[PDB]
């Protein structure tokens with residue numbers, strides 16, 4: 289593990305799918321979440337369906353083999369490991385939440401943007417309107433934009 | 448590691464009342480939340496009516512004059528200032544949340560326990576069992592107990 293990915297070409301794989309959403313909507317939410325970050329960095333993300341990916345996206349509940357157990361519905365929503373091999377980079381989403389394309393649950397796209405930020409080495413922001421602020425609030429995903437603080441943060445890590 | 452209150456007799460006043468629950472239930476939630484901390488320290492909390500209360504409890508929404516704006520329903524729930532004169536110690540609750548006596552919305556008692564922790568000088572815990580863990584999840588308020596970590600934390604400040 290370290291502060292940054294030591295390469296700019298980073299693969300991801302969707303390990304399994306939440307039954308809360310259509311699989312194609314999960315694929316789209318995750319693809320768009322990676323795009324948020326590739327839009328403002330030299331990082332390039334590719335989805336793979338076979339083989340070992342850098343960032344594994346997982347839906348799981350309770351204790352799921354990483355010593356950071358999820359806690360049922362509410363509370364912790366998701367977590368991600370910083371850059372590194374193996375579990376490094378991986379992003380886990382609590383299946384006990386109800387994942388949604390928009391609101392009426394926990395929005396997958398917004399949560400994935402936040403978690404991928406961690407996967408890339410970004411920590412939390414103290415600006416409530418940054419996506420890296422450590423609280424979830426739904427915003428219209430159609431008009432979602434990274435805050436200037438988020439852009440500054442990720443560009444500071446990847447020149 | 449501080450600041451801490453340099454006294455053991457600490458006063459509070461409830462400035463205003465959320466319309467989400469009856470006033471008696473607000474008074475009770477706040478009283479019980481102070482008692483949680485009193486039960487494990489030599490601190491004594493008293494409710495007063497006058498203008499120099501140590502800890503003022505206030506419900507407010509949006510930007511409310513202290514450079515720490517609330518954010519509507521969702522996201523931020525409340526915040527509190529650490530020990531100090533004036534606004535120091537004060538605890539503010541986001542009125543755009545729906546404050547409850549039991550399991551739905553956001554439970555006022557539990558949130559008040561957490562915020563009073565901050566008012567007394569405690570920071571966040573990484574232990575998910577601790578009330579000072581920085582994520583809200585409802586637990587049955589009749590089985591609620593401070594974690595060993597919370598007790599160690601507050602006793603390290605006040606004995």
Ligand SMILES: CC(C)[C@H](C(=O)O)N(CCNC(=O)c1cccc(C(=O)NCCN([C@@H](C(=O)O)C(C)C)S(=O)(=O)c2ccc(-c3ccccc3)cc2)c1)S(=O)(=O)c1ccc(-c2ccccc2)cc1
Pocket residue numbers: 363364365366367368398399400402403406412419420421422423424425522523524525526527557558559561562565571578579580581582583584
């Ligand atoms: C580290 C992980 C476990 C994970 C993560 O960040 O990936 N989580 C974070 C866990 N929290 C932290 O690691 C952390 C670390 C340092 C500081 C903070 C923090 O200050 N958070 C805000 C705290 N709040 C106030 C307060 O603590 O008084 C204040 C500082 C603004 S609060 O209003 O949100 C709050 C108030 C009361 C309580 C509370 C706790 C116990 C009982 C009753 C109430 C909890 C939070 C949080 S999370 O909760 O599962 C999570 C949160 C947000 C998102 C997200 C999704 C989409 C878009 C944007 C964000 C995804 C996942």
Ligand SMILES: [Ca+2]
Pocket residue numbers: 358359360361362363364365382384385
């Ligand atoms: Ca959860």
Ligand SMILES: [Ca+2]
Pocket residue numbers: 341342343344372373374375376377378
């Ligand atoms: Ca990995």
Ligand SMILES: [Ca+2]
Pocket residue numbers: 306307308382383384385386387
């Ligand atoms: Ca689910």
Ligand SMILES: [Ca+2]
Pocket residue numbers: 517518519520521522523524541543544
């Ligand atoms: Ca709020």
Ligand SMILES: [Ca+2]
Pocket residue numbers: 500501502503531532533534535536537
């Ligand atoms: Ca005060």
Ligand SMILES: [Ca+2]
Pocket residue numbers: 465466467541542543544545546
């Ligand atoms: Ca309210």
Ligand SMILES: [Zn+2]
Pocket residue numbers: 352354356367380
């Ligand atoms: Zn995990």
Ligand SMILES: [Zn+2]
Pocket residue numbers: 402406412420421422
């Ligand atoms: Zn986070």
Ligand SMILES: [Zn+2]
Pocket residue numbers: 511513515526539
């Ligand atoms: Zn305030």
Ligand SMILES: [Zn+2]
Pocket residue numbers: 561565571579581
């Ligand atoms: Zn807190």
